[PDB]
Design a binder for this molecule. Structure first.
Ligand SMILES: NCc1ccc(CNC(=O)c2csc3nc[nH]c(=O)c23)cc1
Ligand SMILES: NCc1ccc(CNC(=O)c2csc3nc[nH]c(=O)c23)cc1
Lengths: 233, 206
């Protein structure tokens, strides 16, 4: 997979390319991430990357020429078929279904914005889609772009339902006097699977009940969920 | 604000400490971020940071001893009143109300998990709260921790309900597309912004 990035802080992307799972994907030529900075496309001594809005009022926008030229250089490096994504606080909110869709692309271009955003005409002429990583305010699109890279990289071959995970335990047998649930030491696989499934259903119900609303459950899951609910009283 | 971080990849945090608004906050002593790596708390030649789950199944967990010792060193650096946060897919899903609450803390300790996560008993013995950044799967807690730092840093003094109306800057004509004529005249007449914000919202989402 090839990923082009437009950012005023391209060195932030070393957090992705030099470390962990994405870092090993880069070293093994399974993932390639290339960055271009609009500041490097400026013509003036002050390397001006912002510009005033026609409307008026407060806030600046990214200057069109340096940003458009950087996007064009990423498009020329990408070649045919790259999808251009603008990371925006008001774009489509990312979820696992969204990640799965984005991961079908062999080539992506991720545009990070700063200030109040980008000119509407650049969205119409250079952007394919707009995406957000959640309903919270950040200083820019760099952390969202890196989050998107990490999520999609998991889908690349060679790099590596709907319920929260069950509790997990490892050594020691006694941690600050607290013991591991005996079923996990029993060697009874079906009892362990049913205990973990019941815990997963209970944790989903107590912490994130909305996740159960749009979820078809098996007879076993329905039976185990009712059991945990009854024991909760 | 002081933030302690537990991570197997502490160098990832330079993306926060060396650049942009958080980088500026660090340079002006408004924000301090200190990192400890569980690998530095290992006793064996192979610096083993993972361990096998009881009950089997695929996946490994973070080894308890190196992780617990690293958390303890961050707690000793923090002193009284630090809130310990585990970045977890099973945690409270972050939103702006959540950021506002987290931002009231002068001291945080952010614990980043790798592999399938951490021992449930470490959550009871060490963790104050669990937080997620969204309903998507990542390779670790580091990008969520950095996202949390950036969001809360906006609340530090000295650092800084509708869909937006479209905005325009130079040039007047871009790829044959002109700026709406309204945007070059009357201040009150520009109430076309308020209408476009409503018109965009009605057409996009509710
Ligand atoms: N005044 C409106 C305004 C404008 C820009 C910004 C800067 N933020 C981003 O560029 C951003 C990109 S994707 C994303 N996903 C979640 N949260 C975010 O903030 C983001 C914040 C708020
Ligand atoms: N199979 C269980 C499992 C365990 C760990 C991980 C690694 N992920 C995290 O540690 C994480 C922390 S906060 C967050 N917020 C959104 N998404 C995330 O993945 C995260 C993924 C899946």
């Amino acid at each position: 997979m090839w990923i082009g990035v437009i950012s005023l802080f391209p060195e932030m992307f070393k957090a992705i390319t030099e470390f962990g799972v994405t870092g090993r994907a880069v070293k093994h030529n399974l993932l390639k991430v290339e960055c271009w900075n609009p500041r490097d496309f400026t013509f003036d001594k002050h390397k001006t990357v912002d510009d005033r809005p026609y409307g008026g009022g407060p806030g600046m926008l990214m200057m069109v020429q340096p940003l458009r030229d950087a996007i064009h250089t990423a498009k020329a490096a990408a070649g045919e078929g790259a999808k251009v994504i603008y990371l925006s606080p008001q774009g489509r909110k990312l979820d696992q279904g969204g990640v799965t869709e984005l991961a079908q692309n062999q080539k992506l271009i991720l545009v990070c914005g700063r200030y109040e955003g980008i000119d509407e005409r650049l969205i119409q002429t250079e952007i394919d889609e707009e995406w957000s990583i959640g309903d919270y305010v950040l200083t820019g699109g760099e952390l969202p772009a890196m989050t998107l890279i990490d999520a999609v990289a998991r889908f690349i071959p060679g790099v590596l339902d709907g319920l929260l995970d069950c509790p997990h335990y490892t050594r020691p047998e006694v941690l600050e006097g607290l013991t591991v649930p005996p079923v996990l030491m029993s060697g009874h696989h079906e009892e362990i699977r049913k205990w973990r499934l019941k815990q997963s259903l209970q944790r989903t119900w107590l912490r994130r009940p909305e996740l159960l609303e749009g979820l078809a459950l098996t007879d076993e899951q329905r039976k185990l969920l009712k059991e945990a609910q009854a024991e909760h009283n």
